[PDB]
From a paper:
Mitoribosomes are essential for the synthesis and maintenance of bioenergetic proteins. Here we use cryo-electron microscopy to determine a series of the small mitoribosomal subunit (SSU) intermediates in complex with auxiliary factors, revealing a sequential assembly mechanism. In this study, we determined sequential cryo-electron microscopy (cryo-EM) structures of stable assembly intermediates and initiation complexes at 2.8–3.2 Å resolution that involve six factors: RBFA, TFB1M, METTL15, mtIF3, mS37 and mtIF2. In conclusion, the model for the SSU progression through the assembly pathway includes a sequence of binding factors as an integrated network, with RBFA serving as a regulator through its allosteric control mechanism, which was not reported in a bacterial counterpart.
In the same dataset, we also observed a class with a subset of particles with folded rRNA and the additional density that is different from TFB1M, suggesting a later sequential assembly intermediate. Approximately 7% of the SSU particles in this cryo-EM data showed identical structural features and the presence of the same additional density that were also detected in the particles from the TRMT2B-depleted cells, and the latter was identified as the N4-methylcytidine methyltransferase METTL15. METTL15 is the mitochondrial orthologue of the bacterial RsmH and is responsible for the methylation of C1486 in the SSU rRNA decoding centre. In coordination with METTL15 binding and rRNA maturation, RBFA adopts a large conformational change in pre-SSU-3 (from in to out), which is enabled by a pivot point between the KH-like domain and CTD. Therefore, the association of METTL15 triggers the conformational change from RBFA-in to RBFA-out. This implies that METTL15, in addition to its enzymatic activity, has an important structural role in guiding the biogenesis pathway and stabilizing the conformation that excludes the RBFA from the mitoribosomal core.
Residue numbers in the entry:
A (entry chain O): 42 to 238
B (entry chain U): 27 to 100
C (entry chain M): 10 to 135
D (entry chain R): 63 to 356
E (entry chain 0): 165 to 218
F (entry chain T): 2 to 171
G (entry chain 0): 3 to 55
H (entry chain D): 325 to 432
The structure:
Amino acid sequence: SSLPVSPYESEPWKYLDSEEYHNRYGSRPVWADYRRNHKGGVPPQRTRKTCIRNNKVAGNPCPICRDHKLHVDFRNVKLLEQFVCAHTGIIFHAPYTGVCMKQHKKLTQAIQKARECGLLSYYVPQVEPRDADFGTVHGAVSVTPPAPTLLSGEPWYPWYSWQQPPERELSRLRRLYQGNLLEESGPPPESMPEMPT
Amino acid sequence: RKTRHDPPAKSKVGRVQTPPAVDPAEFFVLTERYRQYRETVRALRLEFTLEVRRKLHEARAGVLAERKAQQAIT
Amino acid sequence: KAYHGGHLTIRLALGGCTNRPFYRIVAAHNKCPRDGRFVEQLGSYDPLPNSHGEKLVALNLDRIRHWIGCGAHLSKPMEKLLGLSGFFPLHPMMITNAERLRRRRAREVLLASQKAESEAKETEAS
Amino acid sequence: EVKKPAFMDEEVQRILTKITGLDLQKTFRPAIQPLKPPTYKLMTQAQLEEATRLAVEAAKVRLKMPPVLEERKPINDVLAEDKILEGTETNKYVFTDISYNIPHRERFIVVREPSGTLRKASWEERDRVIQIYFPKEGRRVLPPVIFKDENLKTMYSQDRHADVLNLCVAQFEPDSAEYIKVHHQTYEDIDRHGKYELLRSTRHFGGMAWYFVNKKKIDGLLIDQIQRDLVDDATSLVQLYHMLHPDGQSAQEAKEQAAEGVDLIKVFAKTEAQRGAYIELALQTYQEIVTSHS
Amino acid sequence: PYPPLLRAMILAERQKNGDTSVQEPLLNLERTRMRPWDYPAKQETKGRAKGTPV
Amino acid sequence: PMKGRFPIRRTLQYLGRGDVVFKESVKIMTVNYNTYGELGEGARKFVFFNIPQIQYKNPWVQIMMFKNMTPSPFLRFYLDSGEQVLVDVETKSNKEIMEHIKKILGKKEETLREEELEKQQRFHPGNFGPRKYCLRECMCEVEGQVPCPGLVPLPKEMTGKYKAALKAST
Amino acid sequence: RKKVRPRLIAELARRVRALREQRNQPRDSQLYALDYETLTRPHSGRRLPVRAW
Amino acid sequence: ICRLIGIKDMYARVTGSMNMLNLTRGLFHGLARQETHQHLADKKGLHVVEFREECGPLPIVVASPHGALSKEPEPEPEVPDTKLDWQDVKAMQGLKRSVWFNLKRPAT
RNA sequence: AAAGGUUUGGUCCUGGCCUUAUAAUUAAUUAGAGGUAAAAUUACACAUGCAAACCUCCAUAGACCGGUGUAAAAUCCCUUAAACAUU
Ligand code: FES
Ligand SMILES: [K+]
Ligand SMILES: [Mg+2]
Ligand SMILES: [Mg+2]
Ligand SMILES: [Mg+2]
Ligand SMILES: [Mg+2]
Ligand SMILES: [Zn+2]
């Protein structure tokens, strides 16, 4: 239950420049000398879900998991570059490098974060402006003449407001619905009453 | 949902209508709102009905329609 | 299915997942299923506030006018959306419901004031 | 009144195209993208020259400069104020007309606020919702995080100014404040560090020189063009500076002396140059090298 | 008057087409006036109940 | 190895290289050619190379070919009005024959482009639906909108299970 | 095709049913009869709405 | 064998008999009798130009004739008589490939 | 398919079978919690409850929605005419 503690946790990029890294890896990628154990000639289309379960390590730890000092961080661009095609700029699928699915998901997120912050370079296509004409004189983006009701402060339509029915009309309805009536309602409040708190 | 040939429920033989109670002041105001609202919406549906037919006629027998027809024959 | 009778209608077709509703505004024969065969999609309605706190309605106002000109009815929820946008007048029940809510909050405020006055009587008793 | 020259004026585009330059190797540098096996054709010297001509035609369309516009003015128009609906809704509604055949700057995008006010959508709301319903390849619905000053400084250290600008054209509108802010920040960093060569043979060189001329700080670009033996370009820059500032002391001095060619640059040094002493020194050294060697 | 949005779309079209005017768009309600809800209906086109007893 | 001579003729790219799209008037194109001779070489090459391309772009036009019925090869088009357009292709290259028929009875590039745009009028990018017809199935896919509950669990207060418990509690 | 066989019984039923309807058409005295004690129509057993009682 | 030679990027298919010796002899036979661009330029006297889709229309000259450059353009037939293999053409015709084709594999 | 194993004393050719990949159903052994999608032996017989009303009477609706894969090489695509139990 005691996984080793890396000295480069704070500054992961340092490891890739240290002598220890060069001796172990040289100038080849960290996954160059890894081979996966599987039955048959065609391998499974997914790699193992994870190499480390509850501080225990699987039989053939993947390139990232086998080396604890290797850290998948967006700031450690030199490591992330090894998992991206230099010619096509595509992130390799997990079977290509043999990383486990857990680290591959972690690697993909770090590369995407590094690109967004500008630490890791990528190809930006040249695109034309969205609009052929850049005029801003149409009413949609301009000022429409204020409507007469809007200037006066009245409702847009007269029936939006409460118009007290004539007294004769209120009596006509009390006769039609005699015996099934509700208390008469007056004009509603002019504004929305502030919610009690 | 049931078909017309299905039998009615026995739990629901007793049912009789219980019409809602009417507020005279709000019922009248609402009745007039529906009348004026439906008149405004009928005027707009007619205006939209005319734009559809104007556009259709221009395409079928507009200036541009006739010129292209003769241009092809020539 | 081979329908007999009915009319074209503009309504909201419910999509999305559980607790995540999303609507497609569509023109469809009224007898068709809610999420089934339609004639044209006329927009979408997202009833959940987004990151900016905005409920997003999309309306193809050019095609909507075309189908209203051909007899297409409108569902009551769609009439409310067109009223909020400003393309249609506010629906009668949108105004009535707003008035009912105003009268109901006035009562609550009055009751709270009466309770505070009753609490004031308790304060007087000490 | 003599019209102020515009960015798209046929004369300004001529000078800006010339000083920008062309380089088929830089304009058509290989893209880091999914690749296909190359094709091969046997061509005579006549055919090869024809193909180089077509490449130069395409390089011109590739170098078309992006628009330089003034900052749009905030949209603050209230269509209606239906106070009956006050307090009946908690969140704003944003309604977008998505009829296909409307220019995006002529679409109606309105907002029904909780207070009941029906207003026109602001510029930020207009661009966001048009990306949601008319998505443009390269643009994101929410503003990316690369345009933050700290992140932009990272791109500048890596000499990736042409990408910062290529990204600013995919995301923002030319008249937006964010667009102007990012462009003016890239042009200013190029100035301080004299990295004018990064944007040569690119569509972004015209806007950079335009910005310096309008801001009366072409000194660095002249010193850099002279040191690279591009003294025909430097003269055209001083002509563009004498065109957008006709009443300037430098423009009036060149009329008095009918200066041309290298004379125009010497006039600029004495009259309006912020760092005239250096322009003459670099110009003098260039003349010495040209005269001494040839 | 026209609805708030539909009025702005009409005035915007005027300016685009070069028609300069400050006239307020107005809907005509005369052509489409509704009968009362209790107005007698056409009996000739109304249905009749069937002859199968329940 | 693909069978037959010039197997490139049996590729979709070759069939799509045809440029003669006949006007709606054209209904039938009879091809009278001779299998032996010297002045009919272009006609024989036209039947070999071009007739497939013409049929591919004009599926509703009846192309019927007759062999060694006349001294010289010719093309005769039958129009819907009842007009008959006779073309004489003797001493003419197969390419020349294609260019001639394109001019007299071929639709122009402007017309064909207009028809293409009209076909796609009802596709809208904003429309949501299945992948076959639309870019995005749901608004959850859009950035800034509430994500799908399957991918990202919704807040408890936005769930009917939680709201029902409160209503019971009230 | 040609295996879509004719349906004589279906055609016979349609005509026969239609004929019986014309012969045994009900009258206004029967369709609109009412039982005033229960306010229910005997022909269909439909109870009138409460607002009409 | 490709790793031994130094080839890094290539596709190959082997059909018929899988005899290892005939595959080794056939591989070296074909790889040793190929034609470099410089050889083709000398044989035909024309420039050999390369067009990459990632470089646009930019013409790239990969080999120029050693002696005298010709002025007669190479004949371009309207319809080439090349003999095409059905397996290659079958992909562009829209026919379905096998479930075993282009599966995810480790870096080679 | 980037293929592999397996005829012989041995080699080569031809040729089948099988292996390696992917997914669904069931079964053995085994499993905490949460979110989501889908739920499926049987056109076999069905206990019970519910699934169509509305409404000032006339009418309208119960022809839909929902279900199953019965029958049938049954269809797809397209042309013409006509109504529509409609708006
Ligand atoms: S698919 Fe959009 S909410 Fe689930
Ligand atoms: K075998
Ligand atoms: Mg009635
Ligand atoms: Mg089981
Ligand atoms: Mg159904
Ligand atoms: Mg069956
Ligand atoms: Zn691992």
